[PDB]
Write a protein that binds this ligand. Structure first.
Ligand SMILES: Cc1cccc(Cl)c1NC(=O)c1cnc(Nc2cccc(C(=O)N[C@@H]3CCNC[C@H]3F)c2)s1
Length: 290
């Protein structure tokens, strides 16, 4: 990390005030705070006693983020490494994680706003892919949302990404977001990230429904292998359901690249009447009245 850390600003602790816990784990917490006017920031700590591996993983996330400069990728402000506890300081996303946000805002956005969120996520992912960065854990829980409704990809690093995520279960993998080839033989590429993006599309258009509902991890893998796919969300544009289905091709070579996804979403947004044509929604319940 010593090479890539030279791109990051070392911040003095007297410039940082922590104010409110917004995330927490065994080895540190994430705070909303202020950075000296003064600007809101998010602050992640690593408490004393950390191991060499933990230090390398922790500062490695900042080192990776410091290499990126894109509207849809969380921005690094700097690090505190010369004092303890060490800290990583980023821009503050006021609306938190996208999955929880949508579940708390059920039905409150237009179809155009939801597709705009997907375009922003896809733009971030195209940037990452072309920068030769494979995310491996793309999911609504790892997208953050600000007060302009801008969605930004977060959660960077090497082994810490899948190790730290409770949704990743023993390889340790978040099964129902992961492409078949990454599950079967550990092949993680930007194309398996495209599979995950298709799941994210479904999460957004359903306002945070849990993919595959109560199917077990094994049931999900069996269903996918036998050709089943997630059904159309309610009120979902046909073009958007078609696009998420193409992300879920078993044959990795047949999936769109993020370049294609960005292009398609941009065209649909720029001609928004195209989003008024809806895919048929198969009701799970029949209600009949004389
Ligand atoms: C600091 C840091 C180090 C390393 C990687 C990263 Cl990505 C970061 N940055 C961050 O973790 C974050 C940046 N912005 C964040 N915003 C955030 C996250 C979770 C919750 C909230 C938050 O304020 N949620 C409230 C909870 C109460 N209801 C209203 C919600 F907005 C904000 S977390």
């Amino acid at each position: 990390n010593q090479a890539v850390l030279k791109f990051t600003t070392e911040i003095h602790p007297s410039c940082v005030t922590r104010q409110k816990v917004i995330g927490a784990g065994e080895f540190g917490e994430v705070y909303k705070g202020m950075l000296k006017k003064e600007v809101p920031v998010a602050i992640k700590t690593l408490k004393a006693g950390y191991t060499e591996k933990q230090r390398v993983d922790f500062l490695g996330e900042a080192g990776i983020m410091g290499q990126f400069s894109h509207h849809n990728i969380i921005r690094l402000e700097g690090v505190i490494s010369k004092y303890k506890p060490m800290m990583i300081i980023t821009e503050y996303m006021e609306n938190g994680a996208l999955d929880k946000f949508l579940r708390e805002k059920d039905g409150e956005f237009s179809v155009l706003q939801l597709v705009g969120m997907l375009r922003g996520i896809a733009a971030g992912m195209k940037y990452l892919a072309n920068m030769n960065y494979v995310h491996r854990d793309l999911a609504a829980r790892n997208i953050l949302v600000n007060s302009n409704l801008v969605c930004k990809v977060s959660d960077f690093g090497l082994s810490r990404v899948l190790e730290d995520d409770p949704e990743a279960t023993y390889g340790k993998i978040p099964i129902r977001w992961t492409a078949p080839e990454a599950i079967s033989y550990r092949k993680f590429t930007s194309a398996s990230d495209v599979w995950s993006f298709g799941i994210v599309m479904w999460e957004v258009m359903t306002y945070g429904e849990r993919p595959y509902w109560e199917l077990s991890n094994h049931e999900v893998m069996k269903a996918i292998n036998d050709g089943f796919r997630l059904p159309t969300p309610m009120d979902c544009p046909s073009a958007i359901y078609q696009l998420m289905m193409q992300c879920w091709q078993q044959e990795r070579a047949r999936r769109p690249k993020f370049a294609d996804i960005v292009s398609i979403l941009d065209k649909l947004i720029r001609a928004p009447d195209s989003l008024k044509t809806l895919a048929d929604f198969d009701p799970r319940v029949s209600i009949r009245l004389p």
